């Protein structure tokens, strides 16, 4: 409302100003009620999906594992701590070892990786550790223990009976309710819901397919973007990109002739996980989903460790589709 | 305490009714079971005395609705209290999301040996301090207690009874041989609780730098003595934390207390964490009353 | 081991109990089966001595069998084998 | 919302078991002839209530003797010693 | 009237001189009524002796450090401040501690006059190096409670005499709390728990006894106001 | 959800559930395979140690 | 309370047949469209899942014959505000242009400043020159309902907490003393004389006989009329409805005068609660997170105390086996319990009944049924026969003690038109004087609800320098983050109204009171004051009044200019190191008492089709151990407890009795069995012709 | 005001409301 | 060392209320002692108050008496402000039999020997021409607030109307100190308590009973 209210509640409002405040507050109350109602639905679905992730074996004995950003490099050159380490690095078990400048090992394979060892790592001066995760646990039915790392409730290693799927679902769908909206990207609880439902984003935005420079053109009342391959032969043409959108800004705005990545996002917005799967494999979509959900939850300042979202995402990426029957039983 | 909980007598005589029935049959207050049932139902004077005996060391799950997450159900050792309102410990309000505007809670009762063991071991409040999501504590002292501890540990320059090294005419008049002497001088109107002074501690572990300075490697505290320029409030605060924990000497913002309890839960056993949290609660309320936080 | 004396449903301390077994679920079933043994000892004591040998440690005035169970677990009077 | 006013009352069933036990003990306080006459007269052994002629036949006496033993036993049980124990069940 | 429940004092001895008294069951809510009064009496009603001031050779205005020793002035002061000493002579008496040669000066080095005594002679106070001689005069009197560092009423009558605080009370730290024993058969009485920590002059038992005596006094004056008065008289049992 | 369709297709295919989830085992009332229900914990044997048993 | 009556009327409800359901409710129907101003209150709506679907009419609203909600405005012509009130619907509200009542009218209808606040058609707010205004509001507080207009300092409170205050101002209970609010609006008198719960002198006269039941008024011209009270009449929610007179035998009354207070009234002014002394410190954690502590003075002197009259009812319905007779004799009932019943079967007026007493003794025919051999033996040994006619007497529900105010007996013999089959229906009105208790819900007029954490004794309560103890102690942390500092202003003004002020106008009226009406330059102790809602006490006025209070009895200004006072700790003894806010706040006793909420069950009734425990406090029932709690205990890994709560506490029919028997005999609780919701399912699937079978191998 | 037996309750109304409450 | 032991001095301001000064108290002791004597006076001074009334006409509390303007409960509340001092420690029944036109002042209560009604003009009720009020109050000695004794627990006929009793003669008590505490360290506290009794007893007697109770409880130690 462009008036606006100019009186404090100590000075006492006038009539019309109180009327406008009533607009706002009544809508807020109704919205809070409905939001709680919806948080319930999300929790139910997440519990249904991750009811069968229970820790069976002590150790899957796998070697694969994700990497952690872990205090990215400074331009002048130092180790500035990554702010969101407590959600993305702590309570994890390393698969590899920490070695630097052909020096000695720092943290050996399979350590809880708490605060003192993270301080040791940042003191020794490395930035990326390959750590285990419930995404790449090789056990048949549910995760192992060392993949799940420290149980966040005990402070010790997770037990061999925990129903970590239910804990993950509850911890994800619990801090809803207090999840507001903003002032056409969806930016709140419905955004999270469409992420977990794997919908095509409301504000679908193009993603690159191969590197090279860009063939940028402003057509009639909207854009026309194509990718120049370096060996991708056929040029991928993105024609019907509206004039209402914006080009992606990073580091500067997207300029013509700029070198794009394999799956660089063309338009600032969000992308469909199906497409980034088909282009950049399973790893990329796992990272994309975790980053995208934790972007929402950091925006509200709620601390959720990533392994819960990783449990759910691992439950998403189970099955495969049959494009050729071979000759055996598969439609 | 964090594990205990209140339980109105008129609600523990109709939940444990079989237990109290058996017990006051065994003590020859009733000829048989029917007499015990009628007596209990009529709240005859000696039912209560048996009720305390059948209650002690027997958990009662205290659930709230909606059970948003895993800590919506927790097991407390009941403690018979009068009135008709379940007395809940204030440090589980954050887990239950329970303000006191008229919330209601459901008391269940485990029966079998396995169930009571489950409550006593798995779901007892003292054991489930940390949150399942991010590992931050949820028995952290919140709201009123944090204001108390802030006012306790904040520092006021220009307060009554500071340490000034001014000399020539009179000595420093800031040193205090022991926190006991400091408390005595605080009861008398000389020392403010938040003035900067130099105490000589013998039961508190100095911070790492001072330990490496005065002792280097192996300063064990119960006997050693060392001076520190701090406020009396911070000494009284660090007396709550265990012996092994180093001196803190900061201003207890809520994040500082979160970090302290996180470290103290990551390095020490759980029972120590529970007792320390309870002590922090007590000190926080006692010094929240004195903080004079009013609204006019 | 420095801490204030446990009181009530927290004696013995669970952190000293967990060092005896693998995980807390084993601790729960361990205590519960011992408590059933003890309760049966009390009841079966009416008849001849069965396979139920009850409190190895001396109990209190009126003490619940499960508290007896856990207190023995702490004092290392019992052993177990898992499945 | 329909309470089934026919369900097992839990306390009633256990109370009946306790009554069985206490009555059995008290009757065992009676003499062999007395215990037998009471159990048969009130069908505590099979649920069949035997009458005076049957009881006198299986003991080989006259029914008047059975009725006299019956009255004597009842009066003995009315004595507060073995009576107040079973009063509460009624 | 009848108290209906007679309170009973029972103590748990923790150290040689550290005690935890319990006084149950006090009727509601007398726990606090007598707990806070007892705390104040323990701290500020037991007579005792302490150091009032000291003077020292070799130091006139360089109040930072003493020549010939290792430890600085204020450390000597707050070592002397924690010194248990008993007295009978009411006038401030003087005591002399004095020693040449390097070594560790303790509490037993001091030579007391008639009546005054030290209850921990095996206490470290200071260190001397390289043939130094330390010679400090103590002014010891007896007092009550805790007095601040009394500002020198005279300006320079004793130019070397510098004052110090004086912790007279044999008790050091007293804290207390209440409980809610037996809510049902009794209707929620109270239970007072004390935690008294004294120096090695007197036992906590005697500390509590003296506090009881002094506290009896005043309320007994109040009773003498009207001796024929009715109150809650505990029934001897 | 969609109970009719699920049941009819399961019937047509003679489906056989193994009662191994933590939702199928909360319906039929038996012990759930999580926590203190799995056979590594539910079948532990508790016996007095021979030394204390001898002392007893 | 009377207000809840007058507000259940005047209620607008959009969720009716011919309207919309709570599921087809477009979220655009619940927002306050800018046409609601003066036609429907934006504040007062239920805070449940009904927000916006239920509201209440404005104070001045009036319904057009056609049914459109008209609204009064003042017609301003040629820049001249007149007094010819003209009513307008929403359409003409959109056509024309509307000014504000708090505008500088220059005592001639003339505006003063040309740039005037005004409303345009689409809800826009604009500064029109003062020539195009053709309508002005009739008064402030026109937008607002009846109940919300009774909140002093409303304009300072946030809309959320004001909404809560309005929704809890209808939930107070009628106390036994009913003290008028020290600080209020103008709507305490007009909300009682029009709520119908206050007898009104119809035509002028002089009272002759004033008695607790009847007032006889001698209407001047010959005629006389006897108004009759309703002493201790049960309301529709169990509360008292007394009406005591306020006149004396020689007073002259005029038509339209209040002649007798109602349940919540005192001299005719709506009074729902008491003026309790309040201090705003956080004390020892008992007033932690909205909890409230009380003196024991409130319990003792019966300050907060509500009478609750409950009704019990038993019908002597006919049955096939015979006729149910309400008679004293009952099969096993001994003369000891029977003592209360008089002869007909009803209790005697006054008998203190307790949970389990025989209010009405009714015996129902049962016919001959088999007696277990054991029972036959006992019956003969103890000389008690059968009297087959079974007992089904009414018994006071659990936790419903009290006296028996009155017994009403309806019978067919008296030709009373009972429903068919009922030869006699007797209703017994038990009643109890419930006092304030831990868990009872207390709230002010500003949404600041809270349960009673602890009723402290009177000596461990922070008392003033005068020795007067405070009566409640709210918390501080609840004030700033809820944006309802109304209670603070109400507090300060409250104290001003209690001690009485004296505007130091010796040097002329200070500017602080330059705009304050006359006969406010001085006031008496316990003098009643009122601040209308949107034209109330400007903060400056409160500051100056607070700094101009007269001393109590000695020379002692207890509350300084800041509004705070030096409290002594009643428990320890030392003064608090910082001054604390004290004052007199008007607080109510809400109808959420503990005795209506506490509940327990060990074994009770059981449902019919499924064999679960029943539901609700009317029966015993248990608490729904719902799906989310099952998730919670799956997450802990507690398997045995889940098996317990879902087999041998709810459904395992043969298992429950075994569990009870094993508990009484002192044995390990038996191993649980299959429930009775995995066997009804099995027989249904073997009934829809789907062979569902269990094969271990 | 305008009710015969009105509690004499002094008002802070700076304004003057013309129309009575209906 | 302080050679003056603490002393007490009466200072009457009115017959009902009175100030008491205790001096010279040890430094930092006044507040605690003022609080001790307050928590005693305000809690445990033995007194006497009506326990049960038995109005002749009515049978339960929630009703009216023909003729009286005050329903029974208002009579209960009015009576609960009475101040009667009893000498005997056994229940003693006082009677009141007002008739016809006039106010039932509590000064019309005929007291049994050994009790006295201190506030005479208390307005128990008002009686019109049909007025007839015959109440039989019961006095009883004790301390504190005793909730109304159940008519079931105690032996009582239907007529009995249980009434809460508040056995406490004290009305208002305050304390304050004027500690000089000068730099010379000749510090002392000068407690000034102020008792105010409800005319049942005198403040002096209240303070004396306080002294007795606290002396006993401290002799325990
Ligand atoms: Mg709430
Ligand atoms: Zn793994």
From TrEMBL, chain C:
Any GO MF annotation of the entry: DNA binding
A GO cellular component entry from the record: DNA-directed RNA polymerase complex
Record bears the keyword Transferase: yes
Keywords (A to Z) from UniProt: DNA-directed RNA polymerase, Nucleotidyltransferase, Transcription, Transferase
Superkingdom in the source lineage: Bacteria
Subunit structure: The RNAP catalytic core consists of 2 alpha, 1 beta, 1 beta' and 1 omega subunit. When a sigma factor is associated with the core the holoenzyme is formed, which can initiate transcription.
Family per similarity comment: Belongs to the RNA polymerase subunit omega family.
Purpose of the protein: Promotes RNA polymerase assembly. Latches the N- and C-terminal regions of the beta' subunit thereby facilitating its interaction with the beta and alpha subunits.
Entry protein name: DNA-directed RNA polymerase subunit omega
Organism field: Mycobacterium tuberculosis
Full-sequence range covered: 27 to 109 of 110
